[PDB]
DNA sequence: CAAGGCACATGACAACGGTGTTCAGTGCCGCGTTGCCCGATACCCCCTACCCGTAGTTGACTGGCATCCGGGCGCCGGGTCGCC
């Protein structure tokens, strides 16, 4: 909460695990999953 | 010298002259009042050309932007953390 909120956007993106190869085919691999 | 007899004209008398009205009828000859006739005009159709919205396009490609000062000037008013 300030001026320019995108600022306050880039923060609310925040620190999250960037995914390597196995990490984002597995989560699509239980993605489908859920799918199903 | 007075009374009685004949001429011309005279108080009315209608009826023509000529011309102005009358209700009357029927037209005379200009406006209209209406049936056509067309002519244009709105209004259905078919065709395709083009405007506009939707949906894909797979090497990889992972945090931006330039702010802002030489007001100036003062006050309000609140916040804000030290203070003892």
Known sequence: ????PVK???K???KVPLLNAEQEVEL???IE???F
Not at 1 to 4: E, G, I, R
């Open 1 to 4: 909460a300030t001026a320019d």
């Open 8 to 10: 306050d956007y880039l």
């Open 12 to 14: 609310q993106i925040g």
């Open 28 to 30: 699509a691999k239980r």
């Open 33 to 35: 999953a859920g799918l």
